[PDB]
């Protein structure tokens, strides 16, 4: 199937409570595989998936060097942006960055990503051409000018088309027993009377991987989007995910409703009804 790698950086200032914290996490698809936290007792890149543990000392040293350097770089960036927005030294602020590559079913680069945010708002993003930038405001235009002068887009393109894809392919092979395994949802429908007049039908999907899933209720074959309570997909803690969708239906009309489940791990899409 299709796969992706992403790194997620958070840099957060905290005036009066030391220097800004820098944390980096790396993911392949929905699986975290490394972390770095400048607040750790002894900051170093740590493995978070079994298949990465086989990488040699040179790998871990290289990662840690990069993240230690980033810690300093992002502290300078926080100072810069505080200035770009005329902000005082009193408040806490956050820079976030997410970047990485997407691969198609063929294993080739589908597209690359590189986006930054300040205080939860989009700041600057690399365009899909991997050659130009989209700046959100006049502050981000300052960054854009600096990055154009320094050939940053060219640097990102080289990384995204090269090392990013090369290492993602390596991780996918080393972790093939898990990263390339889709676990189908275990499904069931529960029934919960709410009154004499209505009952809740809840369609469950449990233990699936990856997180991508489609869960929908239909009434007489008509989608019930507006009337469905669909909770956010949530992690079980064992790598897998959970989700449910609920509709409140008139008593006695339960059989007019069907739950439909789509997921990569299923031999075929599921159609469920309440089974009294």
């Amino acid at each position: 199937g299709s796969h992706s790698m992403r790194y997620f950086y958070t840099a957060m200032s905290r005036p009066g409570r030391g220097e800004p914290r820098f944390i980096a996490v790396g993911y392949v698809d929905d699986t975290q595989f490394d972390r770095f936290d400048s607040d750790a007792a002894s900051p170093r890149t740590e493995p978070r998936a079994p298949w990465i543990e086989q990488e040699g000392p040179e790998y871990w040293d290289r990662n840690t060097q990069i993240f230690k350097t980033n810690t300093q770089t992002y502290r300078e960036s926080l100072r810069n942006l505080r200035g770009y927005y005329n902000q005082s030294e009193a408040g806490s602020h956050i820079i976030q960055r997410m970047y990485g590559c997407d691969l198609g079913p063929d294993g080739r680069l589908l597209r690359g990503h590189d986006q930054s945010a300040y205080d939860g708002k989009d700041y600057i993003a690399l365009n899909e051409d991997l050659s130009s930038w989209t700046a959100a405001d006049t502050a981000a235009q300052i960054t854009q000018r600096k990055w154009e002068a320094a050939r940053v887009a060219e640097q990102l393109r080289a990384y995204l088309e090269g090392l990013c894809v090369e290492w993602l392919r390596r991780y996918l092979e080393n972790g093939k027993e898990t990263l390339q395994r889709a676990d189908p949802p275990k499904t069931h429908v529960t029934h919960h009377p709410v009154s004499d007049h209505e009952a809740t039908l809840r369609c469950w999907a449990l233990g699936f991987y990856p997180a991508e899933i489609t869960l929908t209720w239909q009434r007489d074959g008509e989608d019930q989007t507006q009337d469905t309570e669909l909770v956010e997909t949530r992690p079980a803690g064992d790598r897998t995910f959970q989700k449910w969708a609920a509709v409140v239906v008139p008593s006695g009309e339960e059989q007019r409703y069907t739950c439909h489940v789509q997921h990569e791990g299923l031999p075929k899409p599921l159609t469920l009804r309440w089974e009294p």
Partner: peptide
């Protein structure tokens, strides 16, 4: 593996 030589904003 993460991006090297990252430039400041």
């Amino acid at each position: 593996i993460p991006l090297t030589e990252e430039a400041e904003l």
